[PDB]
Amino acid sequence: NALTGIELYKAKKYEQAMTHLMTPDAQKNPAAQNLIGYLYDKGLGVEKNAEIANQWYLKAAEQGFAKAQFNLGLSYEKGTGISKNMVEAVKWYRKAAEQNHAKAEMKMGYLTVEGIGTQKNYKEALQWYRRAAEHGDNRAYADIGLFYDQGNGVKKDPNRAVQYYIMGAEKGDGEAQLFLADCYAKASGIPYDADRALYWYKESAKNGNITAMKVLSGIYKQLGIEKNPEKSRHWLEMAKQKE
Amino acid sequence: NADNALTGIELYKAKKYEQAMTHLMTPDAQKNPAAQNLIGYLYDKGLGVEKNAEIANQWYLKAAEQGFAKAQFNLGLSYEKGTGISKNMVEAVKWYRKAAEQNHAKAEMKMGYLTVEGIGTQKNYKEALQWYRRAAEHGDNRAYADIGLFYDQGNGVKKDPNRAVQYYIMGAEKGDGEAQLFLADCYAKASGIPYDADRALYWYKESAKNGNITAMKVLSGIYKLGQLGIEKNPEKSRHWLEMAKQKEAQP
């Protein structure tokens, strides 16, 4: 039974989970096939073997299991157990993204912007990030705003870019809170507010910790704030130590 | 340019069904499984195209054969309700299971009921409880009231009235129109929870506010017979008897 084999996986009983998933009725379950591949891919209960993992990913992916064709596209991108191939990764990332897979839609948006494994398409890449944001991945909101802040595929509208930064700032994204705090400083798409800029750099330290400290250590050395010695400098350690 | 299938999906989400079919019916978009399922749904509702439940199942099948869980659910639902195809429960459980195996919440709610009652599949109490748990993990708030029934009746597990109440409380807070009735029953029956009349009436009200017909007929009998220590109100018991009346009106 496949359902009992998944409960054994949650209990880290990897050997007993493998036995239930190898049952003839469970071996035909794509969710069980993808889990068997994950065990060989990480070495849980067996030896780590990416080549055997891909054969189980392929079985479940050929049934249309989105989670599997994402794992298979990952093996093509990282070259684990197979030759690194970006054209084949996009082929499998697209199969999963068409089924509302959040991480796959993030992959599709990233590779379509850069042109890796597929033709560069700013129009289609913006569509992928919208679905990725709608399907859970809160990192997509900041990626969407860059299309409007730069005019890629759409008309350069700094006001629409801030709308997506705000949506990403509510849900706790460091990159979105970075752009929002920057929009409050340069008055891009939103009226200037020195207090709210600093307020969205502070919340950007609670959730995540990007290199807004390159701007933090720069304005204390601006925005209605008197130049602080300790501030303009203590922000540079966390900007250099994490580099 | 932009993708036709992706454009049609966001056009449907914008409630612009006429423009969506213009992009969905393009040859390249008709290969997308999500677009195929959306075409079938629009054929079912007659939005952007003439209504046709038989053509709807043709598009459901094209996407269900690609492994799209939504299409596998809609195709299985067409077999249960007989929409666009002759009714068949052994084919409904086949496509419900394919979708439920892919973490489809509404399909897992079907597998739990069909394995509890034994329709189309051999009855299994332990397997049915695991489906309802998955439906609760995947966002369907109706699963909590169904999970608690396993403990109120001792089906596959030990008869625990207390833990049944805890699931009714969870479903009641999630706004489920069915868990509030079972929770109000526990407050009145004092099963698995101490008796409370003023709190039983509250959940009986919220249950009817969500459209629970069984709660309305129980609430009308309380306002009429004067139960749970409150003044009899024949005027309000009529309002809950009339709004409990079900009628297969034809639009």
- In terms of Cβ atoms closer than 10 Å to its own Cβ (0-12, 13-18, 19+), residue B26 is middle
- In terms of Cβ atoms closer than 10 Å to its own Cβ (0-12, 13-18, 19+), residue A105 is buried
User: Nearest to residue A100, comparing CAs of B93, B20, B5?
Assistant: B5
B108: which chain A residues are within 8 Å (Cβ-Cβ)?
A: none
Q: Tokens for B184?
A: 């109000």
Cβ count near A152 (within 10 Å)? 15
Q: H or E element: which one contains B92?
A: helix B89-100
Q: Assign 3-class secondary structure to B216-248.
A: HHHHHHHHHHCCCCCCCCHHHHHHHHHCCCCCC
User: Nearest to residue B112, comparing CAs of B85, B149, B165?
Assistant: B149
- Chain Cα centroid distance, residue B162: 25
Q: To one decimal place, what's the resolution in Å? A: 2.7
Helix, strand, coil percent values for chain A (each to nearest 5): 70, 0, 30
Could you give the C-alpha distances from B133 to A84, B139, B142, B144, in angstroms and in order? 39, 10, 11, 8
A131–B6 CB contact, under 8 Å: yes
Breaks in chain B after (C-N > 2.5 angstroms): none
Report, at the CATH architecture level, how domain A1-84 is classified: Alpha Horseshoe (1.25)
Return d(Cα A5, Cα A156) in angstroms, integer. 52
B130–A100 CB contact, under 8 Å: no
Question: Phi and psi of A213, rounded to 5°?
Answer: -70, -20
To the nearest whole Å, the CA of A56 is away from the closest chain B CA by 16
Q: Which residue has the tokens 């039983």?
A: B200
Q: What is the dihedral of CA A44, A50, A56, A58, to 10 degrees?
A: 150
B7: which chain A residues are within 8 Å (Cβ-Cβ)?
A: 127
Return d(Cα B55, Cα B240) in angstroms, integer. 41
Q: Which residue has the tokens 């009735």?
A: B181
Is the distance from CB of B129 to CB of B99 less than 8 angstroms?
A: no
- In terms of Cβ atoms closer than 10 Å to its own Cβ (0-12, 13-18, 19+), residue B109 is buried
> Which among B7, B102, B127 has CB closest to A31?
B102
A64: which chain B residues are within 8 Å (Cβ-Cβ)?
A: 33, 66-68
Q: Tokens for B133?
A: 């748990």
Please tell me the experimental approach by which this structure was elucidated. Answer: X-ray
Reported in sequence order, the residue ranges of A100-139 that DSSP labels E, i.e. its strands, are none
To the nearest whole Å, the CA of A197 is away from the closest chain B CA by 33
B83 touches chain A (CB under 8 A): no
Helix, strand, coil percent values for chain B (each to nearest 5): 65, 0, 35
DSSP one-letter code for A179: H
Return d(Cα A13, Cα A19) in angstroms, integer. 10
Q: Which residue has the tokens 């029934």?
A: B149
Return d(Cα A79, Cα A81) in angstroms, integer. 6
Q: Domain locations in chain A?
A: 1-84, 211-243
What is the rounded end-to-end Cα distance, in angstroms, of chain A? 48
User: Nearest to residue B228, comparing CAs of B249, B205, B199, B197?
Assistant: B197
